[PDB]
Write an enzyme that holds these catalytic residues in place. Structure first.
Site, short mmCIF file in Angstrom:
data_model
loop_
_atom_site.label_atom_id
_atom_site.label_comp_id
_atom_site.label_asym_id
_atom_site.label_seq_id
_atom_site.Cartn_x
_atom_site.Cartn_y
_atom_site.Cartn_z
N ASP A 21 0.82 -1.23 0.00
CA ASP A 21 0.00 0.00 0.00
C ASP A 21 0.85 1.28 0.00
O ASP A 21 0.32 2.38 -0.05
CB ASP A 21 -0.98 0.04 1.19
CG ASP A 21 -2.36 -0.56 0.86
OD1 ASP A 21 -2.42 -1.66 0.26
OD2 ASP A 21 -3.38 0.08 1.20
N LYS A 24 6.21 1.40 -4.26
CA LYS A 24 6.77 0.43 -5.21
C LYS A 24 5.96 0.11 -6.48
O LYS A 24 6.32 0.57 -7.57
CB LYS A 24 7.12 -0.87 -4.48
CG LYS A 24 5.97 -1.49 -3.73
CD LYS A 24 6.41 -2.70 -2.93
CE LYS A 24 5.22 -3.35 -2.25
NZ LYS A 24 4.44 -2.36 -1.47
N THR A 25 4.89 -0.67 -6.35
CA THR A 25 4.06 -1.05 -7.51
C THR A 25 3.63 0.14 -8.37
O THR A 25 3.21 -0.03 -9.52
CB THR A 25 2.80 -1.87 -7.05
OG1 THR A 25 3.21 -3.08 -6.39
CG2 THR A 25 1.94 -2.25 -8.24
N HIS A 65 3.26 -7.88 -0.04
CA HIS A 65 2.24 -8.41 0.87
C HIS A 65 2.58 -9.85 1.29
O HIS A 65 3.35 -10.53 0.60
CB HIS A 65 0.86 -8.35 0.18
CG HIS A 65 -0.26 -8.91 1.00
ND1 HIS A 65 -0.62 -8.40 2.23
CD2 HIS A 65 -1.12 -9.92 0.75
CE1 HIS A 65 -1.65 -9.08 2.70
NE2 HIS A 65 -1.97 -10.01 1.82
N1 LIG Z 1 -1.07 9.99 -1.34
C1 LIG Z 1 -0.29 9.32 -2.19
N2 LIG Z 1 -0.73 8.19 -2.75
C2 LIG Z 1 0.02 7.48 -3.61
C3 LIG Z 1 1.30 7.90 -3.96
N3 LIG Z 1 1.80 6.98 -4.78
C4 LIG Z 1 0.87 6.05 -4.96
N4 LIG Z 1 -0.21 6.34 -4.25
C5 LIG Z 1 -1.45 5.55 -4.21
O1 LIG Z 1 -1.51 4.62 -3.11
C6 LIG Z 1 -2.32 3.50 -3.54
C7 LIG Z 1 -1.44 2.25 -3.60
O2 LIG Z 1 -0.28 2.47 -4.41
P1 LIG Z 1 0.61 1.23 -4.92
O3 LIG Z 1 1.79 1.75 -5.64
O4 LIG Z 1 -0.30 0.30 -5.63
O5 LIG Z 1 1.09 0.54 -3.55
P2 LIG Z 1 2.05 -0.76 -3.57
O6 LIG Z 1 1.46 -1.65 -4.59
O7 LIG Z 1 1.98 -1.28 -2.19
O8 LIG Z 1 3.38 -0.22 -3.95
C8 LIG Z 1 -2.80 3.84 -4.95
O9 LIG Z 1 -3.98 4.64 -4.92
C9 LIG Z 1 -1.62 4.67 -5.45
O10 LIG Z 1 -1.97 5.48 -6.58
C10 LIG Z 1 1.79 9.08 -3.41
O11 LIG Z 1 2.87 9.54 -3.77
N5 LIG Z 1 0.99 9.79 -2.52
#
Ligand SMILES: Nc1nc2c(ncn2[C@@H]2O[C@H](COP(=O)(O)OP(=O)(O)O)[C@@H](O)[C@H]2O)c(=O)[nH]1
Ligand SMILES: C/C=C\C=C\[C@@H]1O[C@](O)([C@H](CC)C(=O)NC/C=C/C=C(\C)[C@@H](OC)[C@@H](C)[C@@H]2O[C@H](/C=C/C=C/C=C(\C)C(=O)c3c(O)cc[nH]c3=O)[C@H](O)[C@@H]2O)[C@H](O)[C@H](O)C1(C)C
Ligand SMILES: [Zn+2]
Lengths: 385, 208, 99, 83, 60
Positions: A21, A24-25, A65
RNA sequence: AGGGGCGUCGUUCAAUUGGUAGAGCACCGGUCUCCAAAACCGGGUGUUGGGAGUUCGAGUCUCUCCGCCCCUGCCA
RNA sequence: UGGAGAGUUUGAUCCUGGCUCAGGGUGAACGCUGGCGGCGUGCCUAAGACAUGCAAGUCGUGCGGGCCGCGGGGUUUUACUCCGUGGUCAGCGGCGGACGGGUGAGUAACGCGUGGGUGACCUACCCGGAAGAGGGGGACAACCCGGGGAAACUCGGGCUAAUCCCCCAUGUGGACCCGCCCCUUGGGGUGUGUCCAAAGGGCUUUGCCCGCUUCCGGAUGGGCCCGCGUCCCAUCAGCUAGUUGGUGGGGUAAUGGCCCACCAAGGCGACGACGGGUAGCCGGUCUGAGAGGAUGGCCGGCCACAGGGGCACUGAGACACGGGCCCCACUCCUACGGGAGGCAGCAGUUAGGAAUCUUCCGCAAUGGGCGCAAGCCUGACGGAGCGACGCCGCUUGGAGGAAGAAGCCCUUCGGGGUGUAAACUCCUGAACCCGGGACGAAACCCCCGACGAGGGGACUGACGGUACCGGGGUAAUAGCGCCGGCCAACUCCGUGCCAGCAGCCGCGGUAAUACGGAGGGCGCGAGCGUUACCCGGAUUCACUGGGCGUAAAGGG
């Protein structure tokens, strides 16, 4: 209608770790959509490529995860370095901690931390409290934490600018410039290992696709030597008996490659081979080289409590899961006379009876897990059976 | 491929001492000369009256082991012998003799049959000029069999061509001990071939 | 994606149109002629019929009435006419038909 | 139209043709109208080629276009040679 | 029918059938080839192996 | 690759009261018999699917593996 | 020039009779094992669905242009780009895309086989013969310009060339109507009337080469018809209205209810109609003493089909595998109004399945299409690749060598066997290393002769630096079945109606040549076994060649 692929810059595999969350992704779908402006033609782990102006990249973005350990643990080895992603809002959470530990268990030299979600809660300490606890845990885990290229920026924003219009050169967005900071401070620091094109070919198999019209393709990063169309190979590990066929296609990131060598996650099309005949774990080696084996010995080093490992010790007749390569098998354990009660902290040399024939080989190393925790490491000695 | 293994073992089992070694299996110890009884943990007991089958099998294995031939090869020849006009008994033996590795042996050159094979197989032998390395080659009427050039010097062709001093060949084969030739004058015969084998008994083996 | 067999089709349609028309003609003339052969128009019957008999052998020249598929159309015409005139008419102008 | 070509017989690497008056449309080794000779491209035999005299000439007197490499053999057998 | 002594076939194993009945089992009209699919060979079998699956063991 | 299920003597079935593992057949020895069946004497015969985890101890509560059923995954 | 039987019903016998086995075969598959080469051969299932590429083109010696390189600027420059020009992109026109290649779904039928008929017909290009090729007119592409469209393409206006189209003429001849003669189903002659031909292109130019037109004939290839032959169920017995025939029309190259009017009531059936099932047929193939039986994969002949289904157009020929239209199903593109597409072509994917191959090399050869030719195209074809799938050849060594090692297994504790086998000693040298290295290829074509016959010359080889040849040269693969009887081959232990074997009879209940292992032996060998299926044995559907009193079988 295929598009060829030529080499010029030295290849390098990478990936992104952190907490589920965080970032990365998302920064991956940021770094890629960035180096596509000044460069022509550019639950489950998605291997997405992006080329810079100094080197060619692979990038293995593991979904992260828990539950997705076995699928994460794999690609970990396949990478020369990992981009530890941390969010400004939150901080060092269980996953950010878990991924780093496992990031050490599976080799992986050097770490390049990136502070994402910067565009959230502006705080003097926050932005400089995170850069602290990072090196606090990285070094608590024997990493160069006190000298890790930590960058800062927001990916979510950095991308929304590139979706307005493809081309967006250097520092023309300031935000899409912090992506040029990590993407720049990355081809630096993290070097290139020794890719020996002298050893008899051998590449582990990660995923196995069935490209329509052509046949079955086995992806995976070559471990040594090389292979081009026309070379015979062997499918060692799992299955009744080691299959033998010929490579009729070698491609680098969906674009026709010529000759792959150790270090590239290249997919290989195997001559007439049903897709059931090929699966995870197996290895593609030069004919005659390496064979399938069940029992073996090893200079296994049983960790201790203070390092995640066990803290009670096991007996002769223990069934753990060993990770030789991109796979995981289980096996019984019957060590030499006496030498019973092998509690935490031992270099014992017992014997394993894996239930699945895996591509063993004296010298090859592995690890042990049981109950979702790295119980130990090791390396094969004398191959019994 | 052409058997290859304990041979005086057959010398025995067939009960009619064979000549698969040429020298020893011709001396005071063809094995038969010390054990005229079949091999095995048993090989010497109340031989139950041989079944009508056994009899014919043995009378066949005999004639075939004499030439070393394989069953496939052997049976093909027999079949060929049939369709050809004239007593199949004679004819069969005829063709069986026209064999090269045999006419090599049926002319000196080699101490045994198993040897006459490694000979032809290794070039050393020759037909009307051009050489042959195929045992199965069937010599015709009017073809001399000479040795090779790079051969007439070898240690083996010597002794073998030595014993030829005086000794004679069947009325169907001539021979120049020095010119190392010899013409296949005519196909042999049931008689000429004083073989310890009843052919009509073998002819009957390939019936039911 | 495609072939120069198309050339063969384009023509196909053209030629189709060509003798598709020559036929309609012969049919129209043949009928018009006989349609008089019983009215008594012995003179202009053998006149039109003599014309029809033209386009017949005419079309026969090419790939229209291919061969003696024309010879037939003819006899059926100058037989249908002749056998209509003797229904009170007598052959006036010496047209195709011959007495 | 009716031609005078060669039909391949004899197994692999052992070509042996049959000089025949087939029909242009036929298959090279299909039903021929009438064999008039054969030809051995490796000459292996003091009769590597032979052709029917009165015949070849017959089919020619009735329109039978001979292949080029075919005509070569008809000639080598002296078919046209009018003396 | 399942040949040899001792098999590893459970309620969902996949075998490869062949002709051949068994005079005592009133219903059994086919044999299960051994050493094909879920059906393993016969352990230790040193005698008639071609039948019974089991691969040639290296005397070792 | 990721969700979720089932698995207990040899079998069909219990202990959802966490206190070594309980019942009918099946079968096993003792007597009779050449050997069985029957008859009379007497028997729990257990990889709780594996291996580890908490606990003073786990069929039970945590994991991670094995096989299978199932629902979605999956074109270098 | 050709015929073998055995086991098994009984306490025993003879007979009857079924079951079973030994043999041969296969597009094979499964197990174990696996070295080489040659010639074969390889989706038998879903006629399921298919990414991608290639499988049919060619001619400037039919014609007008676009365009680019260039004689040299046409006028004098870059004006009319004329012309010279080898190319190139389409277009027009021609010939070929109907053959070659694939498949067997359908079909029990004149589909096929066989022998015939056609006075009831067709046949491009190819041959032989006859006579011609004289006048004239005209259009549509290309191109220019305007227009709609996401695309695929499409529309309007206007130029222009032909071997494109059309009118008149010549009528050798041919077609047609009526007449006549011959002849006999509509064929051949003849007379009057009527109707019908045609194109120029290249040179080395009053002549050749390539075409054109009409007619007669030859060739080859075909259409239609006919006699006989062609599977199972009669628990399928009656079937039929375009039905059966007629007359007159339409139709076609042509006969015919092929189709249509109208008239008549027929036509077919136990000699099996109709219906149901199954199936492409044949040469042949396997088996068999033969008669027979089974079969129809590769090769050759015929038929049918081209995603399912219907239909025409063009044309000598198709109702057309890589042409067209339409409906349907599925794939694909779409700017949602409409577009593109069919591997049963060659490779390859996937699905199904016990299972069946490389997205190859070459047009060198043979054969084909177009061309005056050069030459172009040719997944036909010539080859290479993978698979013991099959056959044939070859290897894993030949010669020595103990009253006979060891180990192992038997043993009446002497000994016996594995065993001349090995070890070991001479020995030839699979492989491989080095050098040499093809035949398949001689004509199209060039030249003398006339581009005739004949003579001479040159280019050309994918498979290949492979076969083969010389020299050098290491002892260098063995497995599988079986050993109660049939049936070749016996002993110890374990086991104890258990575990297991098993083609038939039957083996296992504590001494098992029958289970399992061991030693030993037999068979065959790069193979050996298994399963499946066909013939044999089976004179067990009996024509050859059986039977019915009581074995099955005489009808009351
Ligand atoms: N507030 C904020 N949200 C972000 C940022 N980067 C990504 N998100 C959002 O956080 C949520 C999860 O991002 P994600 O990259 O999929 O998380 P990961 O998969 O755990 O790396 C999505 O809505 C992303 O667009 C950021 O720089 N700031
Ligand atoms: C482990 C899974 C798969 C491994 C696969 C193979 O591993 C390898 O065989 C590898 C070869 C060395 C291998 O055997 N890995 C196998 C193992 C290797 C282990 C090596 C090195 C170590 O040394 C003892 C090394 C990490 C060491 O540990 C320390 C860690 C201390 C941790 C304390 C825990 C803390 C606070 C904690 O909160 C914590 C937690 O987060 C999780 C669980 N519980 C906890 O309580 C420190 O960081 C040191 O650096 C190869 O890399 C192969 O190529 C591979 C990738 C295929
Ligand atoms: Zn001897």
């Amino acid at each position: 209608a295929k598009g060829e692929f030529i080499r010029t810059k030295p290849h390098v595999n990478v990936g992104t770790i952190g907490h589920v969350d965080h970032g990365k992704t998302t920064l991956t779908a940021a770094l890629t959509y960035v180096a596509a402006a000044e460069n022509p033609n550019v639950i489950n782990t998605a291997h997405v490529e992006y080329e810079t102006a100094k080197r060619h990249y692979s990038h293995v973005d593991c979904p992260g995860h828990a539950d997705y350990i076995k699928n994460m643990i794999t690609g970990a080895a396949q990478m020369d370095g990992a981009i530890l992603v941390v969010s400004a809002a939150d901080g060092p959470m269980p996953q950010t901690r878990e991924h780093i530990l496992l990031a050490r268990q599976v080799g992986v030299p050097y770490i390049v931390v990136f502070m994402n979600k910067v565009d959230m809660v502006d705080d003097p300490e926050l932005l400089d409290l995170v850069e602290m606890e990072v090196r606090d845990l990285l070094n608590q885990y024997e990493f160069p934490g006190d000298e890790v290229p930590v960058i800062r920026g927001s990916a979510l924003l950095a991308l929304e600018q590139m979706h307005r219009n493809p081309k967006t050169r250097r520092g023309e967005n300031e935000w899409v410039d912090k992506i040029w900071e990590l993407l720049d401070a990355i081809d630096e620091y993290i070097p290139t290992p020794v890719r020996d094109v002298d050893k008899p070919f051998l590449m582990p198999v990660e995923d196995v696709f069935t490209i329509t019209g052509r046949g079955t393709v086995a992806t995976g990063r070559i471990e040594r030597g090389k292979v081009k169309v026309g070379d015979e190979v062997e499918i060692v590990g799992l299955a009744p008996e080691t299959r033998k066929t010929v490579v009729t296609g070698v491609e680098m990131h969906r674009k026709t490659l010529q000759e792959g060598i150790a270090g590239d996650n290249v997919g290989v099309l195997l001559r007439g081979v049903s897709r059931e005949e090929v699966e995870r774990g197996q290895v593609l080696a030069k004919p005659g080289s390496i064979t399938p084996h069940t029992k073996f010995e090893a200079s296994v080093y049983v960790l201790k409590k203070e390092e995640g490992g066990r803290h009670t010790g096991f007996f002769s007749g223990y069934r753990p899961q060993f990770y030789f390569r991109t796979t995981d098998v289980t096996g019984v354990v019957q060590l030499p006379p006496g030498v019973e009660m092998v509690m935490p902290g031992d270099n014992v040399t017992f014997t394993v009876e894996l239930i699945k024939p895996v591509a063993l080989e004296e010298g090859l190393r592995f690890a042990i897990r049981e109950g979702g925790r790295t119980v130990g490491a090791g390396v094969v000695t004398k191959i019994l059976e | 491929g052409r058997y290859i293994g304990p041979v005086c073992r057959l010398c025995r089992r067939e009960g009619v001492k064979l000549y698969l070694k040429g020298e020893r299996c011709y001396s005071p110890k063809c094995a038969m000369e010390r054990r005229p009884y079949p091999p095995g943990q048993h090989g010497q007991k109340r031989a139950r009256r041989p079944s009508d089958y056994a009899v014919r099998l043995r009378e066949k294995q005999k004639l075939r082991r004499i030439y070393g031939i394989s069953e496939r090869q052997f049976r093909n020849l027999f079949e060929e012998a049939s369709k050809k006009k004239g007593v199949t008994g004679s004819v069969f033996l005829g063709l069986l003799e026209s064999r090269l590795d045999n006419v090599v042996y049926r002319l000196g050159f080699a101490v045994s049959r198993r040897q006459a094979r490694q000979l032809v197989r290794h070039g050393h032998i020759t037909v009307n000029g051009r050489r042959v390395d195929l045992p199965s080659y069937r010599v015709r009427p009017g073809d001399e069999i000479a040795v090779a050039e790079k051969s007439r010097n070898l240690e083996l062709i010597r002794q073998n061509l030595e014993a030829m001093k005086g000794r004679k060949v069947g009325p169907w084969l001539s021979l120049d001990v020095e010119g190392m030739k010899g013409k296949f004058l005519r196909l042999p015969d049931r008689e000429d071939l004083a073989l310890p084998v009843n052919e009509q008994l073998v002819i009957e083996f390939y019936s039911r | 994606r495609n072939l120069s067999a198309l050339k063969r089709h384009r023509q196909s349609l053209k030629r189709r149109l060509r003798n598709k028309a020559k036929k309609s003609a012969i049919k129209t003339l043949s009928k018009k002629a006989i349609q008089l052969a019983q009215e008594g128009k012995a003179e202009e019957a053998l006149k039109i019929m003599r014309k029809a008999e033209s386009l017949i052998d005419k079309a026969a020249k090419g790939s229209t009435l291919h061969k003696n598929a024309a010879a037939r159309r003819k006899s059926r015409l100058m037989r249908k006419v002749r056998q209509l005139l003797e229904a009170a008419g007598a052959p006036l102008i010496g047209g195709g038909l011959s007495a | 139209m009716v031609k005078i070509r060669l039909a391949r017989f004899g197994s692999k690497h052992n070509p042996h043709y049959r000089i025949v008056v087939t029909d242009a449309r036929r298959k090279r080794d299909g039903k021929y109208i009438e064999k008039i000779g054969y030809y051995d491209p490796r000459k292996t035999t003091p009769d590597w080629l032979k052709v029917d005299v009165e015949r070849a000439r017959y089919w020619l007197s009735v329109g039978a276009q001979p292949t080029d490499t075919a005509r070569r053999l008809l000639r080598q057998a002296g078919v046209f040679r009018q003396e | 029918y399942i040949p040899g002594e001792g098999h590893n076939l459970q309620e969902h194993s996949v075998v490869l059938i062949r002709g051949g009945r068994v005079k005592d089992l009133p219903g059994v009209r086919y044999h299960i080839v051994r050493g094909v699919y879920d059906a393993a060979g016969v352990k230790d079998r040193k005698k008639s192996r071609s039948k019974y699956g089991t691969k040639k063991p290296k005397e070792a």
